């Protein structure tokens, strides 16, 4: 019933944790037409503009560096605070 | 029990770079502040350098801001000073104290015991012993003249310790750029010359140790 980006198990320690595979919007092969080769290199460049927008179940915006593409695992060590830090509680 | 004990120094040549380090035992460290502070020979009590609790801010004085740096490590409890280009008017006794918050100052409860540090150019050099024995009543008094030394301190014991409760030991005093002190003991003269008495000069600094057995003139 929709596109879900957290999902917390595994389809039917592991390497499919958080695998929602019905997010598939699926492939786009692009080509030149013809049996040869084209004569010219060429560039594609796709632009997406989402539209008719609903979306539900807010939550914590990530305040830590992406790792990966799958998972939310982020860097143990270097683990920031999510924003600028100053001297004293005092001081401005 | 809270305890500072802090490590390091000795005889640096002017110039020369050390770090001091103190360890913390029985408090929370991390959440507490931290300062040195050193005394001139006994007398002049001058702050140096405190950290936040954290890493957060470092403060120092007009004295030292340029080349002293202090530093914790909040894994071990451990003070840090570290103090480059190091200059005659360094010489001194440096303490970590421990800096907690009052109602609107603060204050320093606990001292550690200090590390001494003398920054100084000339050798180290072992010092000489000569007995004092006098050339008529029921007390003697006997002395050991030990001359010429240096760094401090040096130790005077007396037949190993057993004469300990009659015994002055006056401090070392600086001329020639070498120390030089005098100790007295005194004695029942039904000890002495009857018995052994020998005063035993030890001087770590050049690993030296001089006895000297104090006979009749």
């Known amino acids: 019933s929709a596109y879900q980006w957290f999902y917390d198990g595994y389809p039917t320690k592991d390497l499919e944790y958080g695998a929602m595979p019905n997010n598939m919007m699926g492939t786009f092969s692009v080509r030149t037409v013809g049996t040869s080769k084209s004569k010219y290199p060429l560039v594609v460049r796709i632009y997406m503009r989402m539209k008719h927008v609903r979306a539900w179940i807010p939550r914590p915006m990530r305040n830590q560096n992406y790792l990966f593409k799958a998972n939310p695992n982020y860097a143990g060590n270097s683990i920031k605070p999510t924003g600028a830090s100053r001297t004293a509680i005092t001081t401005l | 029990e809270v305890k500072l004990v802090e490590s390091g120094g000795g005889s640096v040549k002017p110039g020369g770079s050390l770090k001091l380090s103190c360890a913390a035992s029985?408090?929370?460290?991390?959440?507490?502040?931290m300062s040195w502070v050193r005394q001139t020979p006994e007398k002049r009590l001058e702050w140096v350098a405190t950290?936040?609790?954290?890493?957060?801010?470092?403060y120092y004085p007009d004295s030292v801001k340029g080349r002293f740096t202090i530093s914790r490590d909040n894994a071990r409890n451990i003070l840090y000073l570290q103090m480059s280009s190091l200059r005659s008017g360094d010489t001194a006794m440096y303490y970590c104290?421990?800096?907690?918050?009052?109602?609107?100052?603060?204050?320093?409860?606990?001292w550690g015991q200090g590390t001494t540090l003398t920054v100084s150019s000339p050798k180290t050099t072992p010092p000489s012993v000569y007995p004092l024995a006098p050339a008529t009543n029921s007390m003697v008094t006997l002395g050991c003249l030990v001359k010429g030394y240096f760094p401090e301190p040096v130790t005077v014991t007396w037949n190993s310790g057993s004469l300990s409760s009659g015994v002055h030991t006056f401090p070392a005093v600086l001329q020639s750029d070498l120390y030089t002190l005098s100790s007295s003991v005194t004695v029942p003269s039904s000890t002495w010359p009857s018995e052994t008495v020998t005063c035993n000069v030890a001087h770590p600094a050049s690993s030296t140790k001089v006895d000297k057995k104090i006979v009749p003139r």
């Open positions: 029985g408090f929370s460290f991390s959440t507490y502040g």
């Open positions: 950290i936040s609790g954290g890493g957060g801010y470092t």
């Open positions: 104290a421990r800096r907690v918050t009052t109602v609107a100052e603060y204050y320093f409860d606990y």
